Write a protein that binds this ligand. Structure first.
Ligand SMILES: N#Cc1ccnc2[nH]c(-c3ccc(N4CCNCC4)cc3)cc12
Length: 272
């Protein structure tokens, strides 16, 4: 409803729709207002009571309590579109633009960011939600608190233990078993994409541009990267899904030890 919110600038637009900066007028809470056209939504969930975008289903499942997931505050239906009201940190920067600006990240900052992503994805998985499009574009930095927040569930699914045969996320982040066989399981495809994400943070760019590089799965480092970080990246990018580490094995890996707290991260690395 437009009496409830005051619309500000367009923050961005893409396959997720159009996202505007906004202010809830009853208390001047900062929000992000996202518009998605009905005809451009492919997978529809439905809530326990009416037919909705799958994205709202998944967001409600993960929006209870605190976490590093942008939380859904409200939504509205319009004749041709859905409108989502999402929280907005201030100041905030997409991790993609952040990497564009700074290049390859110091391993200390990548570790903290990567740790927070793992914690956020784990939370999603405990709520029964598979994101399916983990990448730097879908991660926001709360610059003051040094906290990362996951966004854009419009390609996700309910988590399940059987095989997925559909995928509509980012291809250069998708695993080799999707490219060759159009089949994957939720968590090991998620680990693969986290492998891509970690590489992207410590090298400033994704390791694979084409299907054959994905399928060959050979990782070449164009920046200096510690042997432990290299070993973790290659473990997540194991060609056989069952050779990939569990979430727990990632967080017990030697490269993941002694993480900074998020406010520490901001004070040291984000000028807080
Ligand atoms: N604040 C906030 C917020 C809350 C929920 N979803 C978002 N997407 C975005 C967002 C999405 C995309 C972009 N960009 C702008 C830079 N080019 C890539 C697309 C910038 C911001 C922000 C938010």
């Amino acid at each position: 409803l437009e009496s409830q919110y005051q619309v500000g600038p367009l923050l961005g637009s893409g396959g997720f729709g159009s996202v505007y900066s906004g202010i809830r007028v009853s208390d001047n809470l900062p929000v992000a207002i996202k518009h998605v056209e009905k005809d451009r939504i492919s997978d529809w969930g439905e809530l326990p009571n009416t037919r909705v975008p799958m994205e709202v289903v998944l967001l409600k499942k993960v929006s209870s309590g605190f976490s590093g997931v942008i939380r859904l505050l409200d939504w509205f239906e319009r004749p041709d579109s859905f409108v989502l009201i999402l929280e907005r940190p201030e100041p905030v920067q997409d991790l993609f633009d952040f990497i564009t600006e700074r290049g390859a990240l110091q391993e200390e900052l990548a570790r903290s960011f990567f740790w927070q992503v793992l914690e956020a994805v784990r939370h999603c998985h405990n709520c029964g939600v598979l994101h399916r499009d983990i990448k730097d574009e879908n991660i926001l930095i709360d610059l003051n608190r040094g906290e990362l927040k996951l966004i854009d569930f419009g390609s996700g699914a309910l988590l399940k233990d059987t095989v997925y045969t559909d995928f509509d996320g980012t291809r250069v982040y998708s695993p080799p078993e999707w490219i060759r066989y159009h089949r994957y399981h939720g968590r090991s495809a998620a680990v693969w994409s986290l492998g891509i994400l970690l590489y992207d943070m410590v090298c400033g760019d994704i390791p694979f541009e084409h299907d054959e590089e994905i399928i060959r799965g050979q990782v070449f480092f164009r920046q200096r990267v510690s042997s432990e970080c290299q070993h973790l990246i290659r473990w997540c990018l194991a060609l056989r899904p069952s050779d990939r580490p569990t979430f727990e094995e990632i967080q017990n890996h030697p490269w993941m030890q002694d993480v900074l707290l998020p406010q520490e991260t901001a004070e040291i690395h984000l000028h807080s």
